[PDB]
Amino acid sequence: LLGWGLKQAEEANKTPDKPDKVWRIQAGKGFNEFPNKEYDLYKSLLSSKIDGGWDWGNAATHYWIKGGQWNKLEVDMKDAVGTYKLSGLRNFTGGDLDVNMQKATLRLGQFNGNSFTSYKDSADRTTRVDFNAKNILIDNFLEINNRVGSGAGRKASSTVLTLQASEGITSSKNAEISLYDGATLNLASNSVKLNGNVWMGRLQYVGAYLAPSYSTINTSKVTGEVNFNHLTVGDHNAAQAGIIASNK
Amino acid sequence: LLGWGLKQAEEANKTPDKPDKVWRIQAGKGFNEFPNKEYDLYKSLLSSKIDGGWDWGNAATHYWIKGGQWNKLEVDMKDAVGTYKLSGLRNFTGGDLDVNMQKATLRLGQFNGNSFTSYKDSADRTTRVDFNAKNILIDNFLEINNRVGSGAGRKASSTVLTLQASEGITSSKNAEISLYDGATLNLASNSVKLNGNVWMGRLQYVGAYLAPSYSTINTSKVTGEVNFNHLTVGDHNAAQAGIIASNK
Amino acid sequence: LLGWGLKQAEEANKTPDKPDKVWRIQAGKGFNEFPNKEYDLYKSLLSSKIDGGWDWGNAATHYWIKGGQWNKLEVDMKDAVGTYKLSGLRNFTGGDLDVNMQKATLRLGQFNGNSFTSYKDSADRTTRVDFNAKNILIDNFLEINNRVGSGAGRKASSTVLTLQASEGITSSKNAEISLYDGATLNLASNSVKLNGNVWMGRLQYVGAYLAPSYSTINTSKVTGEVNFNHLTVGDHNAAQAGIIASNKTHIGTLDLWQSAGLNIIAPPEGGYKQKTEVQPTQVIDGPFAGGKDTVVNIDRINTKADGTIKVGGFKASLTTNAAHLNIGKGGVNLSNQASGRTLLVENLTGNITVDGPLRVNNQVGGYALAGSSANFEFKAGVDTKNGTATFNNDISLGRFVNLKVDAHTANFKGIDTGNGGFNTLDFSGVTNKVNINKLITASTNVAVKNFNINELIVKTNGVSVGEYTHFSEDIGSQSRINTVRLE
Structure with a gap:
């Protein structure tokens, strides 16, 4: 009931969270010399300190980092070269990623889209899902702060996607970007062309016709070309x- | 998932409930000599052993018989003469009425319709709301097993309306009869002309698009003329x- | 919120209580041979199995029978002779007295009145304070279901006084009988003359302006003469x-409040006569008719109207099933507040015979302000529809006062509205005859369906225009005016 002039304004200057267990996976040699290999990145790197599971009751999958949904995962590459698909990183609740990928190419979907969800605990934490790629290349749909399963269970609090490409972001034609009730999106890239369905705000739940559902695509740092094709709020x-x- | 061939069949031959506190209000003299007076019946008789209240959380009103929703109210008139409106008996949860009104005229609405709801307790009881009037004359809308408030709170189990007029039942033009997920309707009258909206089955809840919602209008004992106008399932x-x- | 038609009806056929410790004090010899001795009865007999005490917090005294407020005290005299004062039996909570005093004289006050209060426990018990005297002779004030102390503490539930004199009950002049929120009063005597203040209903608490407060004086078994003097509800x-x-009633002064109710109800034409658990049969009745020789001889109807301002009136009202309603020579008075006060003198199965001057602000003319429409109202024979609202005395309507009669045959002797004007002189309920014998109109709204107004005065009203004698509805077939006089 506060409005997006207030609901977004409370989340501008915040401390991230209180994370213990700051995992520091450093992908060393081997990854640093194959520019065209088409690695998977969820399995060839990231499934080590990310454990799946089952949310008992109304789930498809269940994900966190390590031992509860309040632990940080930081990846320190900064020179890894290649290209990396996700292809199915769905119902990642987790918290405090920053996949730091200088001179590395990303892909967020290949036959399967992704998800970066939060949980409404007693702390009401933002997951602060970060990326630091060079080309992100969305290429399949992405649902931020989506409904976890069907209504019940651990509710979804506000969450943040942050992207830090340095050379460009495209998107696929049917890449339905649909970020929800608290979900935001920062960008630090240029030539942003989200050429598929961009869907700010939706029924997070099937019976919540009274949903305030303030979302945000905070492209305030785009140094180049912004372009949508299908903005449906x-x-x-x-x-x-x-x-x-970013003034255009 | 059982289907109405099973879901109605489990409720054919049942014991009513286990009611304690069998209240026996006998309306004696005074009522027995004014054939045209237009009594109210909820207030001039029935509000004595029916207590209202508030359901704490998502309610409009709150009703039972006396001290919890598991007590019987039986009324023994059998010779009272006159005419009786209800005009607002809404969110009556209650249980085990049998308003026995020989040679008496009824009305179930005058500027305000009625309701006869159940609760989904650990016993899953049918309220068995009975009537035994001479002319019922619905004349405003009636919602059986309606949603109590908005979704949450004490859920609505199956319930039964039973009517035993002996001379006729009409209905008003905008008398939207809409009985829901478990609600039935027996009749023992003749010349049944439910000349308004008859609405078997609906969204009991605003998000329950997967509702089985088997309802019934068991007019098996109508000795005369059955007629609807607007049957919308x-x-x-x-x-x-x-x-x-009843074979026509 | 149930109303006295329901609130009294739940207490008709009840089991008394569940009393243990049934004390049986038998006053033997000694008491049985002094007819004129002037015993005290609280101290020479009754203080043995009645223990006083202190209610810790907001009390004056504290009383019960013996060990908690749920024990019976029964006294078995049946032949004791003499006279017995109480003189101060106050804040008796107790429960289940029946002081059985055949051929014995009582007194309920001598320099000090009495009290018979209840407590609102988890059982909500009626104390059933009984008496079985020969002459009771109230003689000082009595407060039944009074406030115990000041607001807080153990609240007062419903309670019952029952009296069974066999020869007579008087009362003193300042014996302010004021029974409250649940208090009743049965009588089985004759020659009842409650000649002091009789006060049904009051603020039981000083801040409870929203009090329902249904009380009762169930004198259904009085075999003789009923008489009040000051009935103030x-x-x-x-x-x-x-x-x-008991099918004959005279009251004296009726000082009704703004929003007071009253249900003077006669006897009928024939008069009066785990496990599943079966509750007993609750016999309840609708509003029936009083018998033939059933008369309500009210002789004054006043109004106590002050305090706050509501957007309408307040409609002090009575109700009668008796075959007549003879409102005597004091007639009708009405104190007028800023808003427009209302007075429903309803009679279900009878007539309305007002033989008195209809005053307002204690004057007959009674001019009123703009917002104040003093809506006098009468309903003669609602459910029988043969009820005449006869005003055998000349009425006079001043300004912003509104006679309306909804009867079967509204007889009159003279209606005087034109001096003050602005009179909605409605007669819409009146079936056939509105037999007005004299009519004064200057600025009136006389809407009569059928009449024979055999004299007509149509006055002027100065320089005010648009204001006139106004038959605003159908005049009909059997209409008649035997004299028109345009002045």
């Missing part, structure tokens, strides 16, 4: 989104 | 109602 | 009392 509710662009 | 679900008529 | 609340009399 509002679905059976008062979905009042917002965009802080 | 199904609302965003697989509402599979049924009717056991 | 209503005190800053909707005190809606009731009386079930």
Whole structure:
């Protein structure tokens, strides 16, 4: 009921969280010399300190970092060369990623999209899912702060996606980007062309027609070209989104 | 998932409930000599052993008989003469009425319709709301096994309306009869002309598009003329109602 | 919120209570041979198995029978002779007295009145304070179901006084009988003359202006003469009392409040006569009719109207099933507040015979302000529809006062509205005859369906225009005016 002028404003200057267990996976040699190999990145690197599981009751999958949903995973590459697909990183609840990939190419989907969800605990934490790639190349759909399963279970709090490409972000034609009730999106790239469905705000739940559902695509640091194709806000509710662009 | 061939069949031959506190209000003299007076019946008789209240959380009103929703109220008139409106008996949860009104005229609405709801306790009891009037004359809308408030709170189990007029039942033009997920309706009258909206099955809840919602209008004992005008089954679900008529 | 038609009806056929410790004090010899001795009865007999005490917090005294407020005290005299004062039996909570005093004289006050209060426990018990005297002779004030102390503490539930004199009950002049929120009073005597203040319903608490406060004086078994002097119902609340009399009633002054109710109800034409658990049969009745020789001889109807301002009136009202309603020579008075006060003199199965001057602010003319529409109202024969509202005395309507009669045959002797004007002189309920014998109109709204107003005065009203004698509805077939005089 506060409005996006207030609901986004409370989340501008925050400390990230209180994470213990700061895992520091350093991908050393081997990855640093194959520019065209098409690594998977979820399995050839990241499934070591990311454990899946089952959320007992109304789940498809269940993910965190390590031992509860309040532990940081930081990856220190800064010189790894190649290209990396995710292809199915779905219902990642987790918290405090920063996949730091200088001179590395990303892909967030190959036959399967991704997800970066939060949980509504007693602390109400933002997951702060970060990326630091060179070309991100969304290429399949991405759902940020999506519904975990069907209504019940551990509810989804606010969450943040942050992207730090340095050379460009495209998106696929049917890459339905649909970020929800608390989900944001920062960008630090240029030539942003989200050429598929961009869907700010939706029914997070099938019966919540009274959803405030303030979302944000905070592209305030885009140094180049912004372009959408299909911006569709509002679905059976008062979905009042917002965009802080970069003056074009 | 059982289907109305099974879901109605489990409720054919049941004991009513286990009611303690069998209240026996006998309306004696005074009522027995004014054929045209237009009594109210909820207030001039029935509000004595029916206590209202508040359901703490998502309610409009709150009703039972006396001290919890598991007590019987029986009324022994059998010779009272006159006419009786209800005009607002809404969110009556209660249980085990049998308003026995020989040679008495009824009305179930005057500027305000009624309701006869159940609760989903650990016993899963049918309220067995009975009537034994001479002319019932619905005349405003009636919602049986309706949603109590908005979704949450004490859920609504199956319930039964039973009517035993002996001379006729009409209904008003906008008298939207909409009985829901477990609600039935027996009749023992004749010249049944439910000339308004008859609505078997609906979304009991705003997000329950997967509702089975088997309802019934068991007019198996109508000795005369059956007539509807607007029979509308199904609302965003697989509402599979049924009717056991009386061979016409 | 149930109303006295329900609130009294739940207490008709009840088991008394569940009392243990049934004390049986038998006053033997000694008491049985002094007819004129003037015993005290509280101290020479009854203080043995009645223990006083202190209610810790907001009390004056504290009383019960023996060891908690749920024990019976029964006294078995049946032949004791003499006279017995109480003189101070106050804040008796107790429960289940029946002081059985055949051929014995009582007195309920001598320099000090009495009290018979209840407690609101988890059982909500009626104390059933009984008496079985020969002459009771109230003689000082008595407060039944009074406030115990000041607001807090153990609250007062419903309670019952029952009296069974066999020869007579008087009362003193300042014997302010004021029974409250649940208090009743049965009588089985004759020649009842409660010649002091009789006060049904009051603020039981000083801040409870929203008090329902249904009380009862159920004199249904009085075989002789009923008489009040000062019947005053209503005190800053909707005190809606009731009386079930014994087919003859005279009251004196009726000082009703703004929003007071009253249900003077006669006897009928034939008069009066785990495990599943079966509750007993609760016999309840609708509003029936009083018998043939059933008369309500009210001789004054006043109004106590002050305090706050509501957007309508307040409608002090009575109700009668008796075959007549003879409102005597004091007639009708009405104190007028800023808003427009209302007076429902309803009679279900009878007539309305007002033989008195209809005053307002204690004057007959009674001019009123703009917002104040003093809506006098009468309903003669609602459910029988042969009820005449006869005003055998000349009425006079001043300004912003509104006679309306909804009867079967509204007889009159003269209606004077034109001096003050602005009179909605409605007669819409009146079936056939509105037999007005004289009419004064200057600025009136006389809407009569059928009449024979055999004299007509149509006055002027100065320089004010648009204001005139106004037959605003159908005049009909059998209409008649035997004299028109345009002045």
